[PDB]
Design an enzyme around this catalytic site. Structure first.
Site, mmCIF file in Angstrom:
data_model
loop_
_atom_site.group_PDB
_atom_site.id
_atom_site.type_symbol
_atom_site.label_atom_id
_atom_site.label_comp_id
_atom_site.label_asym_id
_atom_site.label_seq_id
_atom_site.Cartn_x
_atom_site.Cartn_y
_atom_site.Cartn_z
ATOM 1 N N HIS C 81 0.625 -1.234 0.035
ATOM 2 C CA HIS C 81 -0.192 -0.045 0.199
ATOM 3 C C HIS C 81 0.588 1.313 -0.384
ATOM 4 O O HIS C 81 1.976 0.984 0.476
ATOM 5 C CB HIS C 81 -0.989 0.007 1.305
HETATM 6 C C1 LIG Z 1 -3.392 -4.555 -3.099
HETATM 7 C C2 LIG Z 1 -3.781 -3.517 -2.402
HETATM 8 C C3 LIG Z 1 -5.079 -3.480 -1.699
HETATM 9 C C4 LIG Z 1 -5.279 -4.995 -1.817
HETATM 10 O O1 LIG Z 1 -5.758 -4.783 -0.398
HETATM 11 C C5 LIG Z 1 -6.898 -5.549 -1.846
HETATM 12 C C6 LIG Z 1 -6.610 -5.397 -3.760
HETATM 13 F F1 LIG Z 1 -5.684 -5.877 -4.081
HETATM 14 C C7 LIG Z 1 -8.207 -5.370 -4.833
HETATM 15 C C8 LIG Z 1 -7.755 -4.766 -5.826
HETATM 16 N N1 LIG Z 1 -6.683 -4.605 -6.439
HETATM 17 C C9 LIG Z 1 -7.026 -4.279 -8.170
HETATM 18 C C10 LIG Z 1 -8.896 -4.464 -7.662
HETATM 19 O O2 LIG Z 1 -8.646 -5.419 -7.030
HETATM 20 C C11 LIG Z 1 -6.663 -3.375 -8.476
HETATM 21 O O3 LIG Z 1 -7.202 -2.982 -9.477
HETATM 22 N N2 LIG Z 1 -4.829 -3.352 -8.374
HETATM 23 C C12 LIG Z 1 -4.250 -3.230 -7.334
HETATM 24 C C13 LIG Z 1 -2.846 -2.982 -7.245
HETATM 25 C C14 LIG Z 1 -2.463 -2.420 -8.817
HETATM 26 C C15 LIG Z 1 -4.070 -1.975 -9.335
HETATM 27 C C16 LIG Z 1 -3.972 -0.476 -9.488
HETATM 28 O O4 LIG Z 1 -5.072 -0.125 -8.922
HETATM 29 O O5 LIG Z 1 -3.168 0.478 -10.247
HETATM 30 C C17 LIG Z 1 -3.379 1.295 -10.371
HETATM 31 C C18 LIG Z 1 -3.120 1.589 -11.758
HETATM 32 C C19 LIG Z 1 -2.819 3.502 -11.858
HETATM 33 C C20 LIG Z 1 -4.942 2.085 -11.980
HETATM 34 O O6 LIG Z 1 -5.680 0.585 -12.725
HETATM 35 C C21 LIG Z 1 -4.874 -0.360 -13.420
HETATM 36 O O7 LIG Z 1 -4.280 -1.348 -13.721
HETATM 37 N N3 LIG Z 1 -4.619 1.312 -14.531
HETATM 38 C C22 LIG Z 1 -3.582 0.015 -16.147
HETATM 39 C C23 LIG Z 1 -3.463 -0.567 -16.391
HETATM 40 C C24 LIG Z 1 -2.290 -0.778 -17.590
HETATM 41 C C25 LIG Z 1 -1.551 -1.619 -18.055
HETATM 42 C C26 LIG Z 1 -0.696 -1.746 -18.992
HETATM 43 C C27 LIG Z 1 -0.845 -1.084 -19.948
HETATM 44 C C28 LIG Z 1 -1.661 0.619 -19.762
HETATM 45 C C29 LIG Z 1 -1.880 0.014 -18.640
HETATM 46 C C30 LIG Z 1 -2.656 1.817 -18.071
HETATM 47 N N4 LIG Z 1 -3.937 1.033 -16.488
HETATM 48 C C31 LIG Z 1 -2.654 2.081 -9.173
HETATM 49 C C32 LIG Z 1 -1.143 1.328 -9.406
HETATM 50 C C33 LIG Z 1 -2.824 1.585 -8.089
HETATM 51 C C34 LIG Z 1 -1.707 1.177 -7.120
HETATM 52 C C35 LIG Z 1 -2.775 0.968 -5.381
HETATM 53 O O8 LIG Z 1 -3.238 1.511 -5.214
HETATM 54 N N5 LIG Z 1 -1.546 -0.227 -4.856
HETATM 55 C C36 LIG Z 1 -1.186 -0.264 -3.161
HETATM 56 C C37 LIG Z 1 -2.235 -1.516 -3.644
HETATM 57 C C38 LIG Z 1 -3.382 -2.092 -2.508
#
Ligand SMILES: CC1=C\[C@@H](O)C[C@@H](F)Cc2nc(co2)C(=O)N2CCC[C@@H]2C(=O)O[C@H]([C@H](C)COC(=O)Nc2cc3ccccc3cn2)[C@H](C)/C=C/C(=O)NC\C=C\1
Ligand SMILES: CC1=C\[C@@H](O)C[C@@H](F)Cc2nc(co2)C(=O)N2CCC[C@@H]2C(=O)O[C@H]([C@H](C)COC(=O)Nc2cc3ccccc3cn2)[C@H](C)/C=C/C(=O)NC\C=C\1
Ligand SMILES: CC1=C\[C@@H](O)C[C@@H](F)Cc2nc(co2)C(=O)N2CCC[C@@H]2C(=O)O[C@H]([C@H](C)COC(=O)Nc2cc3ccccc3cn2)[C@H](C)/C=C/C(=O)NC\C=C\1
Ligand SMILES: CC(=O)SCCNC(=O)CCNC(=O)[C@@H](O)C(C)(C)COP(=O)(O)O
Ligand SMILES: CC(=O)SCCNC(=O)CCNC(=O)[C@@H](O)C(C)(C)COP(=O)(O)O
Ligand SMILES: CC(=O)SCCNC(=O)CCNC(=O)[C@@H](O)C(C)(C)COP(=O)(O)O
Ligand SMILES: [Cl-]
Ligand SMILES: [Cl-]
Ligand SMILES: [Mg+2]
Lengths: 207, 206, 206
Positions: C81
């Site tokens: 996080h």
């Molecule tokens: C582990 C966790 C909490 C757990 O309790 C509970 C979780 F596991 C639950 C869950 N996670 C997700 C879904 O459900 C989920 O989607 N994410 C968890 C961390 C990473 C991701 C997230 O949020 O990412 C975005 C990002 C910009 C937007 O999302 C995208 O995916 N965008 C995207 C992807 C691409 C890929 C290739 C090329 C271009 C792209 C353009 N846009 C960024 C990095 C955020 C990172 C963050 O806040 N980290 C902390 C983590 C917290």
């Protein structure tokens, strides 16, 4: 009067808690009477015994009146690789590698797992090969028993860490001299108040 | 605004992550709004509360805005055996042994599990009975919480071992006085950038 | 002669032990030939790689001739996080919170997990982000790998503690300079008697 140690499920409606001894299938697992395993989902105590092979001849020995917490795992000696050179178990894949099958002298075998009587083993504990656990010991939940445990000691952690001894060494000697788990069970039953309540100076005096 | 705290599944298409509070059906489990449990197979958060018995009367308390990692386990006080003499629980097997029934005063009772607000609890964490976890602390994954955790502490291991404090002692009490989690949701929404970015001095002066 | 490294189930009648590399369908997970996973219930090695998102771009690299104990889990960098202020991941719930999303410059990323060749990983091992594990090391069962493991080290516990080195410093450098895992497979078979029995000096001779 007492329950039946031959009854696999000794609690009405509870299909998860099992007296270990009647369920055992395996010659080299030897468990005392009245010791139980509180299952998670009804799995057998043996299913929790791991890497156990007849070739090695190692035994798992549990005393009487032991408590085994759900998920407790016993890792027998079949788990350790050869460490003279590369640990990789080449022979397992056969296809011309069967030739390099080790002998038991080549393996780091540590001996039987032996648990005494009246041991409270916490939930999700892992017991590693060769460890001895003394009578009346308490293993905290989530512990990984890496080394031996003295009678009436409280331990826990990964690797295992000594916490405390439940009583003094003087009272511990008296509990080990009395060995109530080995008495005729009419005698266990008419002294159960004292065994439960730990007043050693009462049983002191009956004998 | 933000998400509905009474929405059990606040992430669309996600059947695992749950808001705890609206799933609670036991009167001794008090969880604050927005705290979530990212479950493994879609199981209840209550399913992770073990050895919880009404006759013991011990409660599990969790604050607001907490992250509870998958597989986190809460071992309540009903798990500790009588240690006066013999740990074995004869009475459970009745057939004459039900007479030797222990009272609440015979068992070693340590009290409620009380977790604070804005706490990040790791994956496969086990919390022991009677431990208190202060606001804004971090529990590393796989940790076994065998003792209390001070607010804004990073801890982990088995037994639990203190790693470091997230901020300086002074800054930690600027956070504990502010109590951003106890502010009106519209005040939180207007200051989320600094709450997230950690600008304590901005919130202090706001 | 020897098993085929592109064979998923290289032990006849065994549905649990799997060669890892031929099961890998996701890029950023690069595992060497002959490195296997002893699964508990036939689960895929990938399923043990958690919090692995392409958006972050970290990789799990594993060498050749490694043994991965059943239940070993790999916690990738997506699991961490943001810690500037509140660790609560507001943006995930959307409903007006989606625009408070972090960039990877804002998170505590720690790099790829890299494990060398001829590593023996115990049952139920948990490997955390950014950890590097050297060649020939031995990870005790139930260990949480919190830091790097030197080559031909034996380690275990939670947090990880150093136990001992398998050989003397001089014999270790000899094993690292030989790199038997990278020799042509016909060369390895001729010398497996000495690879397996630890006779390093004749290997150098050979
Ligand atoms: C582990 C966790 C909490 C757990 O309790 C509970 C979780 F596991 C639950 C869950 N996670 C997700 C879904 O459900 C989920 O989607 N994410 C968890 C961390 C990473 C991701 C997230 O949020 O990412 C975005 C990002 C910009 C937007 O999302 C995208 O995916 N965008 C995207 C992807 C691409 C890929 C290739 C090329 C271009 C792209 C353009 N846009 C960024 C990095 C955020 C990172 C963050 O806040 N980290 C902390 C983590 C917290
Ligand atoms: C646990 C492990 C790696 C895990 O990652 C993955 C394993 F758990 C997977 C698995 N294990 C087994 C099967 O699948 C298995 O049988 N064993 C594991 C250790 C103990 C035992 C073993 O091999 O014992 C032989 C013993 C002489 C002979 O045993 C045989 O099985 N012989 C045999 C099998 C044949 C099969 C088909 C046709 C002909 C055959 C002829 N002989 C000896 C003691 C080997 C010891 C050793 O290398 N220890 C270390 C282990 C490492
Ligand atoms: C974890 C454990 C052993 C495990 O190995 C194996 C167990 F987990 C298996 C299992 N547990 C139970 C069922 O199956 C079980 O009931 N208990 C385990 C500990 C707590 C409890 C117990 O026995 O408590 C009684 C208490 C008088 C029970 O009697 C009641 O009359 N209870 C009651 C009355 C009610 C009246 C109205 C409405 C609801 C009611 C609910 N309960 C008291 C406090 C405690 C007794 C003790 O020796 N503790 C230690 C044990 C430890
Ligand atoms: C096996 C069962 O019936 S209870 C389930 C597991 N629970 C535990 O092991 C609790 C651990 N408690 C401790 O280690 C404490 O330090 C203790 C002094 C024993 C209380
Ligand atoms: C709430 C979730 O499910 S996030 C998954 C849990 N993962 C973790 O907590 C990672 C464990 N590592 C740590 O906490 C490290 O000690 C730290 C230095 C804070 C990074
Ligand atoms: C991966 C497999 O095939 S077995 C699983 C791993 N085994 C273990 O962790 C056993 C623990 N004991 C040790 O490693 C010892 O310290 C040892 C180095 C053999 C001495
Ligand atoms: Cl996940
Ligand atoms: Cl990274
Ligand atoms: Mg430790």
């Amino acid at each position: 009067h007492g329950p039946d140690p031959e009854n696999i499920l000794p609690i009405k409606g509870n299909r998860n808690l099992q007296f270990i001894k009647p369920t055992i299938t395996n010659e080299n697992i030897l468990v005392g009477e009245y010791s139980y395993y509180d299952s998670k989902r009804g799995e057998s105590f043996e299913d929790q015994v791991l890497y156990h092979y007849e070739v090695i001849g190692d035994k798992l020995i549990i005393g009487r009146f032991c408590s085994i917490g759900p998920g407790t795992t016993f890792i027998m000696n079949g788990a350790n690789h050869r460490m003279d050179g590369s640990t990789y178990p080449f022979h397992l894949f056969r296809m011309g590698w069967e030739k390099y099958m080790p002998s038991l002298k080549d393996l780091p075998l540590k001996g039987d797992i032996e648990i005494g009587n009246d041991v409270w083993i916490g939930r999700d504990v892992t017991i590693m090969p060769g460890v001895k656990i003394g009578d009346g010991a308490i293993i905290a939940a989530e512990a990984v028993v890496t080394k031996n445990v003295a009678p009436y000691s409280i331990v826990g952690g990964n690797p295992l860490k000594f916490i405390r001894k439940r009583f003094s060494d003087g009272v511990i000697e008296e509990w080990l001299a009395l060995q109530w788990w080995n008495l005729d069970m009419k005698i266990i039953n008419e002294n159960l108040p004292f065994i439960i309540n730990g007043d050693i100076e009462m049983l002191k005096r009956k004998r």
